[PDB]
Structure formats: structure tokens, C-alpha cells
Amino acid sequence: DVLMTQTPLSLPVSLGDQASISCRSSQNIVHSXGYTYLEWYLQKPGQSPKLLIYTVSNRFSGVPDRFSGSGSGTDFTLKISRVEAEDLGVYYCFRGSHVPTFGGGTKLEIKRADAAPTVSIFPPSSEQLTSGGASVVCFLNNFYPKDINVKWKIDGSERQNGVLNSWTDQDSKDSTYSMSSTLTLTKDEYERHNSYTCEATHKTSTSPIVKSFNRNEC
Amino acid sequence: EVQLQQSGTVLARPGASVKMSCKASGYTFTNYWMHWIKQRPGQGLEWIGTIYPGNSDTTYSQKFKGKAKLTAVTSTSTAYMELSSLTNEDSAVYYCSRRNYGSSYAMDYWGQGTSVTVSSAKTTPPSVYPLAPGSANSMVTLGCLVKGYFPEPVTVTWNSGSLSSGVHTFPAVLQSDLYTLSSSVTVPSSTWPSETVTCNVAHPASSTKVDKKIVPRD
């Protein structure tokens, strides 16, 4: 159907660099008249989306000349020169004609040197056990880029049910990302197994980072 | 100035209905289309529909017909959206915005948004567990697990907030109507356990505050 495909989903850049966000319509965006209704909106954390560019290349009042847009037919582009700190957030193209539709969005992020995650695995606390629950926490902190995957192994056997994941937003201090993975079981199932393993796969290594412990050992 | 003030936060049960308002001031309410955009936690903007206050004409996205009901009160320059058969997927922030034409052709003014949560959970305090290193380097990672609470939010600090850097408090995850989250903190191994490290979790809704001092797992 006439969707709005926006790419890329994540656009990391160095402040001062130029950023280009693309948007392609599955059909030629008609003409609302001579104007072509394709807008660019920016949404910063905890805020409402805000108008950047309308009718493909017209800059909304108050918007810096650093932002400019262009394109025609099915391909449109938002160009941001000298990206600055306050420009970080999520951009959305929008087809305002016929069937109004938003693009998937593009997160303008900071680029930095790759960094391998520091992985920390923790067995259930005796307090949680006292109550009959069993959570095994694993942290994968300060890694770059954002892409990563976690796999849990209970006695060398992969486990994927009962796993809860969460990711922080880029760290405003070292520009890294961090993830938190929690495998939750019942005390009984947890006490029926000995080996607990958390293992991270990140581009910074051809081999996965493995953290683990055995319930018996203390 | 054009202004759009939206009704406040709402908690609703599945199957029920909710009605939020978008009060307009600063312009000729009956001359512009009012649009409604939906945003799910961490997700992208999604066009719901629009209504022209001048004659109540409405146009809805195929995905929302039967879900969103748009009305408008001329007398009070207020637009309304009513959602039916609420489900968990309706939980989201809902924005209203006026689409201008003339000086600009786009949604130039947006409301602050109305956060709607759909849940059958009742206030539940969180269980807090300490995450401490199991076996006896230079840097040490500690943490706390805040599990099974409702509703959001929860505040986590370390050493009453005096311990700020090296801290990662993760976004909560919804699992079977309840929320779970964690917070890690990495410090110099010459600081722990010689110096104290405590996480302070507070949960306003349930009038609860919990402190866990991290201690080695001897």
C-alpha cells in the first residue's frame, strides 16, 4: 500500500557533520494545489513533535537555515548541515495528502569509537528466594554501537521464555548504550539447575562475551 | 499565539472508553482541520484521523475506524477523541494538532499530548532486591532490581543521589500487567565495600520507599 518508508532508522553522526534523512513513498505523492504536501517533523525526548519543513522544502518560521529539504515524486530528503547538540532526537517525514501517513522515523544519534560492553551477571538474591521468586540479572553496559544481542543458557541450554530486556538511551556522557536482561523463573525451577549463563554478541568481538556462575558455588 | 491544551493523564480498564479533549485558542477554530496522532511507548507517530470543526466532516485512517471517535464543539473551540473497546495496545500518548494552510501547509501547532494507560492492574508496591557480585578487580558493578510494581513511575537513586555517574537506571518493562526495572552502578573497587553503596527506590503511587545497602555475598 502507499506507505512512507523512512531510512535509516538510526543515523549516528559527529556534531558538526551533515545528516541526510530519506523518505520514499510507495506511490507518487500527488499535487495539492502545485504544492507537494510532504513535511518533516522533529521530536525531542519528552516533547511534542514540532514542524521543521513543509511543502518539501519550505522552512517553517523559527527554523534555522541549517535545515533544508528537497526531492520529488517518491524520493524526499531532509538535509541537516552542522548537526548540533540540540538537533538530536527523532525525525519523521509526513505525507499530508490523500492518506496522511507518517514515516517510520529516524533517530539522529552521536557517533563515537566502538566499545565492547562490560558484562555483569547476578544470581537471584537470597531475599527474592526467601519469597519464592528467582531473577537472574545481567548487565551489558557502555557499549557502542547500540546493536547487540543477549542469549541465556540454563545448563548449556538456550532459554528465551521468561526473559525481559530493556535499553538505555544514548549516554549523555560517553555516548555509549547499556542494556539490562532479566531472566525470571520460579524458585523451584531455578533450584533444579546449576549453570546460568549470559552471553553478549557485539561487533567488537568475533567471539561472544560470556558471564556465568553455578548455583552451588559460593 | 495559537494554543492547544489537552486533557490530563488517564488510566482506564480494558473494554472501557475514554474521552480526551483538545482545547483551542488563538485562531479561528472552525476554519482549520484538527488532526490526531497516536504514539505508543518508544514507537513512531501514527496518524489517527482529522475533523473539520466547520461541518463536523471527519476522515479516519482505516486502522482506527471504529476505535477513534472524533467530535468538535464550536462554542468552546474544543476537539474531542473517544476511544472504544480499550486494549493494552491503545496505551499511548495522544497528540492533537492543527493543520494550517496559507502561511504554511502542515501541522504547525501541537497539543502537549494526553497519556493514556490501559490496564487491569491495581496499585502494587515494588519488591526491591540487591544485586551484588557473587565471588571475590579494579572496577565493580552493583545494582538493584525493582520488581512487580504498578503503576509508573519509580525513582531510583544511589546514595540518595550523591552517587550519580556510572549509574544506569533502565526503562521499566511491562510483564503481565506489572512493571519491572533495574539500576546498575559501577564504582572503584577500592570504594566498595569499604564505603557504603545504597540504592533508594521510591514508588509514589503506592506510598512506598525502600533502601537496600549493597553488601558482599559472603
Author numbering:
A (entry chain L): 1 to 27, 27A, 27B, 27C, 27D, 27E, 28 to 95, 97 to 214
B (entry chain H): 1 to 52, 52A, 53 to 82, 82A, 82B, 82C, 83 to 100, 100I, ...
Which sentences from the paper describe this structure?
Structural models are observed with a clear electron density, except for residues in the heavy-chain constant domain (Ala130H, Gln133H, and Thr134H of the unliganded isoAsp form, and Ala129H, Ala130H, Gln133H, and Thr134H of the dT(6-4)T-liganded isoAsp form), which are disordered in most Fab structures, and except for residue Asn28L of the dT(6-4)T-liganded isoAsp form. Figure 5 shows a clear electron density for the residues around isoAsp28L of the unliganded structure. His93L in the unliganded isoAsp form is in outlier regions. The conformation of CDR L1 was completely rearranged in the isoAsp form compared with the normal form. In CDR L1 of the isoAsp form, main-chain hydrogen bonds are observed only between Ser27eL N and Tyr30L O and between Ser27eL O and Tyr30L N. In the normal form, these hydrogen bonds were not observed; instead, a total of five hydrogen bonds are formed in CDR L1. A structural change from the normal to isoAsp form would cause the loss of hydrogen bonds; in particular, loss of two hydrogen bonds involved in the side chain of Asn28L should cause the rearrangement of the main-chain conformation of L1. The tip of L1 (around residue 28 L) of the normal form adopts a type I β-turn, while that of the isoAsp form adopts a type II’ β-turn (β-turn classification is from Rose et al.). In the case of the unliganded structure, the average B-factor of the residues from Asn27aL to Tyr32L of the isoAsp form is 48.0 Å2 (the value of all protein residues is 32.6 Å2), whereas that of the normal form is 23.1 Å2 (all protein, 36.7 Å2). The high B-factor of the residues surrounding isoAsp28L would correlate with the loss of hydrogen bonds.
